[PDB]
């Protein structure tokens, strides 16, 4: 790694004040940050450990807001007694990610900010054309092996997929990201606006100033969140990112799907809310084939690249089967 200088922050505001300085980076769990430092894509001259900030560790489930601070680990959220019952899609987006060891390390704040698994992005010593890493240098994946790359939200500059499972469940259910600057004030960002499309600027992933730090997340507590599932398709059965995944939920009110929520993981540059599959199923009773045919509407915005065409076939099917699994609960 680069010979970084190690600094420990004693408050959220001092972490935001130190983060703002010229290439400094927060360290929470390390399972992304430290890995990409060894890959060579991260070389912060100053690394700021934020564990031992006790203010960010609060967690509670309510009748209205599920609320957790940024330093809550993946395991703590998933193991909370209400998580599986109140938010199955959130719970499923957790235990189906990484390994138990990683989930014990991984904070919710760092989980949202995890980076693409694009093989060319992660090997800068070999491939020097990455616009996300190295603005203006090109994209090595366009003419390379794009099997892992995006069929939705892609630009000419970056085709990288956002690998994370948790954000997919949050984006479906309209979570809010709360962030804080060095002077202590607070911004609340709807999560679908928190993740940015790469466009011509793949190096800007999130709506976060260098000024700012993620302090907390909150999710609306809804009967759509209560009846939900996270379905993850992958090559092997565990310890891998999704080839395709969908978080889905709805409330059944008067024998009818209402507040249908659907989001697509693993196929897009950012967690992708499928709004037209939702609208097509709203006011509709849960049934096998109408769910499957409505899911195929995602194929009107989808664009296959050379090696990722299988993701086009998977996308409507993981949407359908995640919905089918949701309608089996209550």
């Amino acid at each position: 790694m680069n010979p970084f200088h190690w600094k420990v922050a004693q408050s959220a505001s001092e972490a935001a004040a130190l983060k703002q300085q010229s290439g400094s980076q927060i360290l929470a769990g390390g399972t992304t940050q430290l890995d990409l430092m060894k890959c060579g894509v991260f070389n912060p001259p100053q690394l700021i450990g934020i564990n031992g900030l006790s203010e960010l560790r609060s967690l509670s489930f309510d009748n209205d807001k599920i609320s957790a601070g940024a330093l809550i680990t993946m395991s703590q959220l998933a193991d909370h007694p209400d998580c599986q019952q109140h938010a199955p899609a959130i719970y499923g987006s957790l235990w189906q990610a990484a390994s138990p060891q990683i989930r014990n390390m991984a904070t919710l704040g760092g989980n949202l900010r995890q980076r693409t698994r694009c093989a060319y992005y992660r090997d800068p010593a070999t491939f020097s054309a990455c616009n996300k890493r190295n603005p203006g240098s090109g994209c090595a994946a366009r003419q390379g092996v794009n099997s892992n790359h995006a069929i939705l939200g892609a630009s000419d500059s970056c085709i990288a997929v956002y690998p994370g499972d948790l954000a997919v469940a949050l984006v479906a259910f309209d979570a809010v990201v709360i962030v804080q600057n060095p002077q202590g004030e607070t911004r609340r960002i709807a999560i679908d606006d928190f993740f940015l499309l790469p466009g011509e600027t793949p190096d800007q992933e999130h709506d976060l100033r260098d000024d700012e730090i993620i302090v907390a997340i909150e999710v609306p507590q809804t009967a759509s969140l209560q009846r939900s599932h996270y379905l993850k398709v992958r090559d092997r059965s565990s310890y891998e990112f999704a080839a395709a995944s969908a978080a889905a939920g709805f409330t059944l009110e008067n024998g009818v799907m209402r507040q249908v929520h659907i989001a697509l993981g693993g196929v897009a540059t950012k967690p992708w809310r499928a709004t037209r599959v939702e609208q097509a199923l709203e006011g509709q009773p849960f049934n096998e084939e109408t769910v499957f045919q409505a899911a195929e509407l995602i194929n009107q915005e989808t664009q296959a690249l050379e090696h990722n065409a299988y993701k086009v076939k998977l996308a409507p099917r993981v949407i359908a089967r995640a919905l089918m699994a949701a309608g089996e609960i209550a």
Binding site: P3, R117, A119, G144, V145, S147, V233, D235, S237
Partner: protein, 748 residues
């Protein structure tokens, strides 16, 4: 069971306790004083020259002592290749010139005082290239094809027999690049002192390491000491050292200090070879009853521009069934890639995969049950060698495997068996591995405390050599084998050959069985010949060795520790082995120092056999595949340790599961880079991928195969598994996937 736990018992691993508490020390966990840390540099282009290399920013960083490249070189001699009688799988010599023959090639090493300093400074070396057009794939234009003619199979007349065959199956079967990926990365500690070098090298063959490192350094073989008591597995990837050890050795000699050099996990993909990609065009002629009268095969595999290594797809092709006319020819394709290396069952694995999928296609062309088809082709002898089998239980493997699996209830039509949203499929394949033999030696010592120590240079790579050599000696020493200590994996120990070709359990158990018999005779003689012994005058025929003591049938007795006190220390050390008693010592060195002196029985064809049955669950929407049930019946002959044998069996099967479902090398066609080189993008089976596995032992002791009665084990479990999984996926779906692996994109 039985208290001494002799050969044939199923006991716990004698090395188990030091492994479960973290005491056992692998290669780089040893502690020389003030060691330096090397980090290897690898090329980023497939073909060309190094036009510009500037290390000054690396030499200027913290703690960096040296950077060795072709611009700041150190002599490394081209080693003698394995095929020429040497210890070298790869003859590549790093930092001797600017030529780039493949991507990821070792072009240098950075030596620093701490590991963190060496890692950082290695990233600061700037390398520019002048690239030349690269041959990325074996099918590219301009790729030279070298036939392996000495391995051609010309048997009967295949052209005539195929022309008259009623039913012909003609298809191509491919396997991708695969990587052994043992959990212990390739790493070493090279310590050069005063004209000698000691190297801590994870090794399956320590005599081979000693030969190649001496050749690299240009010194006598006796001047190299290799210390490898524990290995984190090679599965074929650590029989012989690779060039990162060469760089570690010459650096240690130049700096006159110990150097710890670890390949990073990504660097182990191009720092040595895995299984090269293979392709085989396989034609089966048969009469309409299913009986096969002809087989024609044309296959090839990748190899580097430098070394000729063949992964030969004909290994099992004429062995398995009763076919009098077989034509097989294999060629290697020289491309820009690292020199290939062994992976579990080399040449046997891809040969069985193509053959045993082709049988399934022949079975569906004639609508014969696949098992029934293997019986109609049963070979009552070896048709390739025209020799009788020594022992072959394959029929009992078919029957006991089919019974346990429920194969009699199979509905032949693909997609017929379904549960919920999963398509069910059932598949089966034959498997085999050959019996090889090599001589070897061992020493047994009675300590002053009355304890036994067994010494052999053979390796325990996780196979259990530590355990079975203690069981062998216990049979003649009258003590429990758990009290016998075994020392292994060091060139200071008695001669031993490679652990490869699944031959070493039989070779070493034979060598220790002789040494232990000789130890028994020595102890009884001492009790009767030592005048201070309470047994001082008595006949040896009436002595027995029991429970740590020598006891006369007249009732008087002498303990083993008491005999140690009465005996000269040199008489308490006994040597034995399976070399001819008259063979000069120099030839005993040469035999174990190369790979070409292995023997097989004349007059008998001796092989292990297996029957593999698999149930897969294919998701109807997603095309994902899961292995629900595995039933295997294996003939390994006599099992030296049935519990360690099962661990080998299921170990090979799980590796075969990764081969079929997930493992693939991914090469970028533009640059020839392997871009999935890491354990995240190169998928090996995860605990959740593997169900409960049933293994059935159908074997009987075969003394025409090995002296001690066992046959091959270590590599048997993988053979044919990938074909049975493909046959099962077809039965679930209706799609033949002839290229591995079978991933969801290929299903839907």
């Amino acid at each position: 069971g039985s208290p001494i736990e002799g050969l044939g018992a199923a006991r716990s691993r004698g090395d188990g306790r030091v492994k479960v508490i973290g005491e056992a020390r692998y290669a780089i966990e040893h502690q020389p004083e003030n060691p330096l840390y090397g980090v290897v540099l690898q090329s980023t282009v497939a073909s060309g020259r190094i036009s510009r290399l500037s290390a000054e920013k690396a030499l200027q960083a913290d703690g960096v002592l040296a950077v060795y490249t072709h611009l700041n070189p150190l002599k490394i001699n081209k080693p003698t290749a394995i095929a020429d009688g040497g210890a070298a799988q790869s003859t590549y010599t790093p930092i001797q010139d600017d030529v780039i023959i493949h991507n990821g090639q070792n072009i240098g090493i950075v030596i620093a005082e701490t590991f963190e300093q060496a890692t950082w400074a290695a990233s600061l070396v700037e390398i520019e290239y002048e690239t030349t057009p690269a041959r990325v794939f074996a099918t590219d234009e301009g790729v030279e094809a070298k036939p392996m003619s000495a391995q051609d199979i010309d048997l009967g007349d295949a052209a005539t027999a195929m022309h008259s065959a009623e039913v012909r199956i003609n298809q191509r079967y491919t396997t991708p690049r695969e990587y052994n990926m043992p959990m212990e990365p390739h790493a070493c500690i090279a310590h050069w002192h005063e004209g000698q070098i000691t190297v801590w090298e994870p090794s399956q063959w320590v005599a081979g390491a000693q030969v190649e490192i001496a050749e690299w350094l240009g010194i006598e073989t006796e001047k190299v000491r290799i210390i490898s008591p524990y290995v984190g597995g090679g599965f074929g990837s650590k029989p012989v050292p690779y060039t990162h050890v060469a760089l570690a050795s010459v650096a240690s000699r130049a700096l006159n200090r110990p150097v710890k050099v670890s390949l990073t996990r990504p660097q182990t993909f191009t720092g040595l070879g895995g299984r090269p990609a293979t392709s085989q065009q396989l034609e089966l002629g048969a009469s309409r009853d299913g009986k096969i009268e002809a087989i024609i095969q044309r296959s090839f595999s990748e190899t580097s521009l430098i070394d000729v290594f063949a992964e030969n797809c004909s290994k099992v092709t004429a062995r398995m069934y009763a076919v009098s006319n077989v034509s097989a020819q294999h060629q290697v394709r020289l491309i820009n890639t690292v020199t290939p290396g062994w992976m579990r069952a080399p040449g046997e694995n891809p040969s069985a995969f193509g053959l045993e999928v082709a049988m399934d296609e022949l079975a569906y062309a004639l609508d014969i049950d696949p098992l029934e088809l293997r019986l109609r082709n049963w070979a009552d002898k070896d048709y390739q060698l025209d020799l009788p089998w020594s022992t072959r239980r394959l029929k009992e493997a078919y029957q006991k495997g089919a019974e346990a699996f429920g194969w009699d209830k199979r509905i032949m039509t693909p997609r017929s068996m379904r549960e919920g949203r999963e398509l069910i499929g059932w598949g089966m394949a034959s498997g085999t591995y050959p019996v090889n033999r090599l001589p070897a030696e061992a020493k047994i010592i009675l300590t002053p405390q009355g304890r036994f120590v067994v010494q052999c240079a053979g390796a325990d790579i996780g196979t259990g050599t530590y355990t079975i050599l203690a069981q062998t000696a216990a049979d003649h020493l009258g003590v429990g084998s758990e009290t016998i200590e075994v020392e292994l994996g060091d060139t200071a120990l008695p001669r031993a050959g490679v652990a490869g070709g699944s031959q070493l359990a039989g070779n070493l158990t034979a060598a220790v069985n002789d040494t232990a018999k000789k130890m028994r005779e020595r102890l009884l003689a001492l009790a009767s010949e030592l005048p201070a012994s309470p047994l001082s005058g008595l006949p040896v025929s009436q002595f027995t060795l029991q429970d740590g003591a020598i006891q006369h049938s007249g009732g008087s007795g002498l303990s083993l520790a008491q005999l140690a006190t009465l005996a000269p220390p040199d008489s308490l050390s006994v040597k034995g082995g399976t070399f001819p008693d008259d063979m000069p010592q120099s030839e005993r060195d040469k035999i174990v120092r190369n790979l070409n002196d292995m023997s097989r029985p004349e007059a008998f064809s001796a092989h292990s056999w297996s029957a593999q049955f698999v149930e897969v669950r294919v998701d109807e929407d997603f095309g994902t595949i899961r292995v629900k049930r595995m039933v295997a019946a294996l003939d390994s002959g006599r099992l030296y340790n049935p519990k360690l044998a099962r661990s080998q069996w299921i170990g090979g099967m799980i590796m075969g599961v990764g081969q079929a479902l997930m493992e693939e090398g991914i090469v970028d066609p533009r640059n020839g880079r392997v871009i999935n080189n890491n354990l995240a993008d190169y998928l090996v089976p995860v605990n959740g991928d593997i169900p409960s596995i049933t293994t059935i032992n159908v074997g009987e002791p075969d003394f025409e195969a090995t002296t001690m009665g066992g046959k091959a084990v270590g590599e048997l479990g993988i053979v044919g598994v990938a074909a049975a999984i493909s046959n099962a996926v077809f039965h679930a779906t209706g799609k033949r996937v002839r290229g591995l692996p079978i991933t969801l994109d290929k299903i839907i």
